[PDB]
């Protein structure tokens with residue numbers, strides 16, 4: 001009789017926000033605290049549920065730097081809902097706002113943070129497997145973390161360390177392709193099980209995407225997803241790192257380091273961060289969080 005959707009005891013469900021979704025993400029308000037939140041909804045009728053174990057992955061991640069806080073997971077009408085800390089625009093939104101190219105200083109401030117972000121995820125025995133500009137969000141204007149790059153949507157995540165055996169998951173192939181083709185590692189294209197290295201290689205592709213404005217396999221189309229995947233993969237293998245990373249030696253070093261990582265191998269995150277901080281220092285940049293998108297006006301649902 002109210003006509004109003006509530007999630008849990010205190011979350012009023014608001015307008016849906018963002019692009020895509022199709023009703024899957026909505027603005028929300030914690031009526032008890034008078035704060036806005038993000039509410040991810042999943043029809044209880046879903047064929048491929050992801051919401052609640054994404055919730056479980058967040059539990060396993062725990063409170064962390066750059067990890068959105070999770071407040072609730074419960075039924076909402078014919079929806080299962082997960083209430084999350086509200087963040088700002090994604091790197092993709094910001095990219096468009098900056099005319100689809102970030103300065104090296106901005107990319108390095110982003111890269112240095114994400115390597116740490118991924119190392120954190122990996123330290124919790126999880127591999128991300130869904131790298132893309134759309135899943136990395138800055139904080140909100142004021143909520144103290146607007147300059148922190150956050151990582152969201154852990155629906156495609158996986159525990160790479162068996163919780164009982166305490167062993168790294170076994171190598172294997174023939175994994176079906178689903179993730180986003182543009183950034184995925186070459187091995188992902190080959191149908192191989194993803195591991196730590198693959199998250200790091202995807203980040204590399206994304207860093208070059210930001211620096212160049214686009215990637216050279218970006219416009220490939222085909223008659224079947226599998227074929228497209230295969231064409232993109234062929235081009236990635238056919239584009240020499242030194243050609244892709246032309247003018248960015250450190251990026252080339254980062255990329256072939258991760259490309260050559262063994263399946264079970266622990267990446268040397270310190271080594272990778274240093275490739276970028278040394279470069280950062282040598283260019284004379286100051287890590288002051290003044291990205292290319294500053295002064296600009298971002299979107300807000302509130």
Ligand SMILES: N#Cc1ccc2nc(Nc3ccc(Oc4ncccc4C(F)(F)F)cc3)[nH]c2c1
Pocket residue numbers: 017018019025038040068084085086087088089093137152153299300301
């Ligand atoms: N899982 C998960 C998850 C958890 C928390 C989040 N916080 C946000 N932040 C957010 C910021 C602006 C926005 O709204 C917009 N974003 C981009 C262009 C235009 C608009 C709008 F048109 F609404 F202003 C929608 C959401 N996204 C989030 C996703």
